[PDB]
Amino acid sequence: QIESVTKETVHPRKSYKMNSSAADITMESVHEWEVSKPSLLHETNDSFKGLITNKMWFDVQLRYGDYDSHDISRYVRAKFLDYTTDNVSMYPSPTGVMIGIDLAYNMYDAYGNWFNGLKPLIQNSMRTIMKANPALYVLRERIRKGLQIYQSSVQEPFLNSSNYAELFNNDIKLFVDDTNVYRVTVHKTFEGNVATKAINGCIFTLNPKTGHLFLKIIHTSVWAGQKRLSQLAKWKTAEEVSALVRSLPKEEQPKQIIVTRKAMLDPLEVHMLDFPNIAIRPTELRLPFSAAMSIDKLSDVVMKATEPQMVLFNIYDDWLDRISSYTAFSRLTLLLRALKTNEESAKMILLSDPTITIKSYHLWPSFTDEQWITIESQMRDLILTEYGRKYNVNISALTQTEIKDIILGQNIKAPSVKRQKMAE
Amino acid sequence: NRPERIQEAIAQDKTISVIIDPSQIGSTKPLLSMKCNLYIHEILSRWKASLEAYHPELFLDTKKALFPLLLQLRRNQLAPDLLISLATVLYHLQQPKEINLAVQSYMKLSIIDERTRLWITSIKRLITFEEWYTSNH
Amino acid sequence: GSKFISSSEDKTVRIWENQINVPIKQISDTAQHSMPFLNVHPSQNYFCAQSMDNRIYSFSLKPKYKRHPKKIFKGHSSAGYGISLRYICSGDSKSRLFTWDWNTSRLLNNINKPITQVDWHPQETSKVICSGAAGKIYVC
Amino acid sequence: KVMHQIRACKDLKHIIYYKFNKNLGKGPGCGFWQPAWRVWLNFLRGTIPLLERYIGNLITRQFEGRS
Amino acid sequence: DWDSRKDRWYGYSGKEYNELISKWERDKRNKEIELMKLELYKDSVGSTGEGLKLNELNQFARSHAKEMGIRDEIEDKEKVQHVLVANPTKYEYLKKKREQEET
RNA sequence: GUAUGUCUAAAGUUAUGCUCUUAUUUACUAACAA
Numbered sequence: 001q002i003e004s005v006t007k008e009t010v011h012p013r014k015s016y017k018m019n020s021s022a023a024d025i026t027m028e029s030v031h032e033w034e035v036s037k038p039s040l041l042h043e044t045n046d047s048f049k050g051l052i053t054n055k056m057w058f059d060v061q062l063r064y065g066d067y068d069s070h071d072i073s074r075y076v077r078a079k080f081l082d083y084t085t086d087n088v089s090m091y092p093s094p095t096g097v098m099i100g101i102d103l104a105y106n107m108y109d110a111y112g113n114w115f116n117g118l119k120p121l122i123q124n125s126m127r128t129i130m131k132a133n134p135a136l137y138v139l140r141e142r143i144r145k146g147l148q149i150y151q152s153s154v155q156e157p158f159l160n161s162s163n164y165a166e167l168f169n170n171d172i173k174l175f176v177d178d179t180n181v182y183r184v185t186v187h188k189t190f191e192g193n194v195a196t197k198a199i200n201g202c203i204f205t206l207n208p209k210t211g212h213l214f215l216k217i218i219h220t221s222v223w224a225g226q227k228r229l230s231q232l233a234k235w236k237t238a239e240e241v242s243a244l245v246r247s248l249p250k251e252e253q254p255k256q257i258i259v260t261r262k263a264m265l266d267p268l269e270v271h272m273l274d275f276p277n278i279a280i281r282p283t284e285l286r287l288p289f290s291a292a293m294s295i296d297k298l299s300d301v302v303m304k305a306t307e308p309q310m311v312l313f314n315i316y317d318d319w320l321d322r323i324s325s326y327t328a329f330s331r332l333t334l335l336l337r338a339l340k341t342n343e344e345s346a347k348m349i350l351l352s353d354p355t356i357t358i359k360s361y362h363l364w365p366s367f368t369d370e371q372w373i374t375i376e377s378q379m380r381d382l383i384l385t386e387y388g389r390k391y392n393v394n395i396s397a398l399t400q401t402e403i404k405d406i407i408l409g410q411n412i413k414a415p416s417v418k419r420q421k422m423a424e
Numbered sequence: 425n426r427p428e429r430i431q432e433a434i435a436q437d438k439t440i441s442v443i444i445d446p447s448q449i450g451s452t453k454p455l456l457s458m459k460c461n462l463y464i465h466e467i468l469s470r471w472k473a474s475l476e477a478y479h480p481e482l483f484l485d486t487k488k489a490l491f492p493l494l495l496q497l498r499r500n501q502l503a504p505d506l507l508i509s510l511a512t513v514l515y516h517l518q519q520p521k522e523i524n525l526a527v528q529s530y531m532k533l534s535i536i537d538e539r540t541r542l543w544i545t546s547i548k549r550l551i552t553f554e555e556w557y558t559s560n561h
Numbered sequence: 562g563s564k565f566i567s568s569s570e571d572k573t574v575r576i577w578e579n580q581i582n583v584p585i586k587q588i589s590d591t592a593q594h595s596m597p598f599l600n601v602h603p604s605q606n607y608f609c610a611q612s613m614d615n616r617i618y619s620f621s622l623k624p625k626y627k628r629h630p631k632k633i634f635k636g637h638s639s640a641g642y643g644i645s646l647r648y649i650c651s652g653d654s655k656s657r658l659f660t661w662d663w664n665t666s667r668l669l670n671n672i673n674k675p676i677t678q679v680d681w682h683p684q685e686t687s688k689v690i691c692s693g694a695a696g697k698i699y700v701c
Numbered sequence: 702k703v704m705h706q707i708r709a710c711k712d713l714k715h716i717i718y719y720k721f722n723k724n725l726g727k728g729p730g731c732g733f734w735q736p737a738w739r740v741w742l743n744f745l746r747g748t749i750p751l752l753e754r755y756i757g758n759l760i761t762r763q764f765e766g767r768s
Numbered sequence: 769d770w771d772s773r774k775d776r777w778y779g780y781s782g783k784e785y786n787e788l789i790s791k792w793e794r795d796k797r798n799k800e801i802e803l804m805k806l807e808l809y810k811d812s813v814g815s816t817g818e819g820l821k822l823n824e825l826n827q828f829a830r831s832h833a834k835e836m837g838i839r840d841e842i843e844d845k846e847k848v849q850h851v852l853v854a855n856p857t858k859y860e861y862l863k864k865k866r867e868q869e870e871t
Numbered sequence: 872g873u874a875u876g877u878c879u880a881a882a883g884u885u886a887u888g889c890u891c892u893u894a895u896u897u898a899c900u901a902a903c904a905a
């Protein structure tokens with residue numbers, strides 16, 4: 001029987017401010033509630049006095065304990081009847097609830113007044129959150145990293161060459177690459193040493209189903225603010241992505257977000273804490289999207305960019321019209337692959353015929369399906385050629401293995417590959 | 425009192441050209457506002473037909489998200505920086521061959537922000553439906 | 562039409578693409594530059610430019626990344642300007658104009674009368690304009 | 702060197718409390734701030750010269766340049 | 769047991785907190801026109817998946833491969849026919865026209 | 872990545888043998904990637 005669950009917006013300070021506390025949630029009731037006298041969560045015998053409330057409040061109270069202050073219940077109680085009974089930072093009601101989380105010990109507890117039949121919900125809630133809040137899990141994982149004891153255990157397997165099929169499955173997705181966010185003009189200096197200067201870049205933000213390549217064009221102005229830009233690249237990337245996700249609706253909020261650079265996952269996890277439903281997918285299979293930006297019109301647009309702007313495109317248009325998305329994506333994958341091997345070769349292949357013309361909207365030249373097929377074959381040969389040159393063993397390839405080689409994703413050490421192989 | 429607010433408004437609701445001039449953005453205000461405000465009402469009505477085909481659950485709250493705009497637009501509470509970006513989205517949304525330009529314009533609109541997100545996000549559903557609506561037709 | 566060059570007061574030259582706004586090449590430091598002019602070079606490889614230190618340079622503008630000067634045109638006490646067609650003709654600060662064989666960097670030194678902004682009548686083969694200070698334009 | 706003062710205060714607390722809590726149990730509710738207060742006064746007495754010199758020189762530097 | 773001894777509040781009924789409620793319970797005892805309508809005139813007046821079809825096509829990749837060049841050929845078939853299965857977009861048509869013949 | 876050091880931050884002081892095309896090395900440098 002709650003009329004409205006409103007969040008009282010406090011300063012960012014509140015989170016960690018300890019001398020005072022404004023209430024985080026304010027709870028407007030339908031009827032008067034008759035809350036119990038203040039008590040702890042596990043204190044079962046909650047005494048229902050004649051006092052009533054038309055409005056409660058919920059406060060969180062994060063703490064980081066020591067070997068000496070490692071009980072939370074006492075602390076939370078103290079906090080509750082400190083801030084209530086203190087003439088700074090008054091709550092709308094003196095009757096309310098206060099949760100506190102010992103982050104150092106994972107010892108949740110809460111104290112305060114209790115609406116009838118509420119306590120069980122809160123207990124269960126806390127139990128759930130502690131079991132798996134995203135933010136708290138991140139924190140534990142962060143600490144774990146700090147202590148180099150990280151048990152490499154994932155619930156969802158990575159995108160290897162086998163699971164590539166099950167990438168997409170009538171399911172709204174998004175795909176991210178942060179490779180060409182921080183590009184540099186290397187130019188000489190008066191002293192003689194090199195000076196790196198930032199160029200405009202991108203946030204390769206693709207959707208394999210629709211073929212809608214979003215890419216927020218990074219204007220160099222955003223680097224002009226700060227230094228240590230390789231890390232900052234990641235941060236801006238994840239920030240931008242997060243913002244984009246926020247902008248889109250709950251239906252069009254993409255479920256599984258895939259990331260090219262596995263290092264850039266780490267801050268994304270943080271900026272994805274805005275919304276927990278958006279699962280992260282660290283790809284085992286490296287896809288060529290550094291060379292994605294070396295497509296003519298894309299690079300053109302990147303250079304053109306004058307400000308913080310995004311200019312989306314359909315990475316494949318005609319292909320969608322002809323065939324399902326997956327087919328289109330295979331072709332695209334081949335193309336990008338070839339580009340990554342060699343740009344000149346790629347362009348040559350594309351512009352082998354000069355009679356063909358790239359459509360005004362489209363990023364790619366519109367071919368007939370048999371000539372298209374031929375082109376694809378040529379590209380594949382290019383990739384294989386590259387492999388032969390560098391890897392020096394492109395001749396005696398098994399089928400699955402060959403497929404992996406095309407992507408260049410299925411690594412030899414990757415145990416997923418062993419799995420698929422084992423299966424066959 | 426309230427009856428003449430029904431009469432004058434519903435009469436005015438059926439009295440408009442559902443058009444956005446791409447050059448009148450440069451001019452200074454209620455004309456572009458109410459053009460867009462009642463163009464959105466057509467985007468609402470085209471939805472109202474194929475509510476059985478499309479998923480209706482999100483629209484029921486889309487309505488409540490749109491209610492701010494209605495209150496903004498007929499008053500001109502909505503800011504010039506928002507409005508120029510907003511009308512730019514709706515103009516490109518008119519032509520079926522500006523679907524790139526539609527979401528293009530929406531992304532540059534999005535890029536204090538609590539219900540503004542909610543309604544601006546709701547506008548993306550209006551593009552999402554309209555883009556699909558013209559496809560499945 | 563595509564590539565675009567612009568030297569500056571800090572003694573640096575910048576090959577750019579038409580609109581890319583990203584330096585294809587910043588030039589070397591210990592020189593100085595003032596006036597940028599492309600020689601009407603038959604291959605059209607060459608971007609010439611006058612200095613502060615009395616010496617007009619030459620640059621292999623194709624590719625833009627190339628910039629090794631072949632032979633430098635010394636002997637024109639510079640505060641001014643210079644233009645090409647075979648020959649490069651540039652004026653000096655103090656006295657007078659200087660025709661130079663573009664191949665060997667040496668030719669006649671015609672009197673001006675000071676100032677110096679030289680140019681060629683390109684529709685013809687041999688006719689120059691000098692730009693003297695205070696209504697003294699000399700033609701050849 | 703204020704550690705001495707701090708240490709002294711600690712000692713006083715230890716002394717005081719255990720003359721203050723003979724039959725009385727444990728807890729925080731003892732007052733009696735006299736001897737500690739005395740300690741702090743004497744510390745201030747000690748330091749008043751030191752701070753007159755120190756802050757003297759400081760503000761002199763702020764005003765007159767350093768020598 | 770440190771934080772128990774520190775516990776500024778310890779060993780108490782809420783005698784001070786009941787006095788706060790008493791102080792505030794006393795304080796309890798002591799205490800659009802057209803636009804609403806203009807907007808609400810419109811209706812509101814309340815106030816695996818497709819990758820399985822790839823997985824079938826990749827299973828059809830097993831068919832053309834099982835026909836020609838599985839293991840015996842090093843490069844001549846198992847690499848050449850490898851280049852001509854699964855990778856290129858044309859393999860959509862190879863299955864599609866086999867579906868069209870099957871229809 | 873830094874110490875550190877320069878730079879900008881707007882108002883007008885009253886005078887008449889070579890050019891060329893390239894491919895290769897080596898060195899140094901590079902908070903750019905591996």
Ligand SMILES: O=P(O)(O)O[C@H]1[C@H](OP(=O)(O)O)[C@@H](OP(=O)(O)O)[C@H](OP(=O)(O)O)[C@@H](OP(=O)(O)O)[C@H]1OP(=O)(O)O
Pocket residue numbers: 711718727728729774
């Ligand atoms: O001996 P110290 O390190 O100065 O710490 C003392 C001491 O606590 P420990 O014995 O745990 O160290 C006192 O405990 P008792 O020896 O008296 O049992 C306690 O005095 P109370 O028992 O009277 O509280 C006092 O605590 P407080 O400062 O609250 O009086 C506390 O000092 P710290 O709290 O600064 O450690």
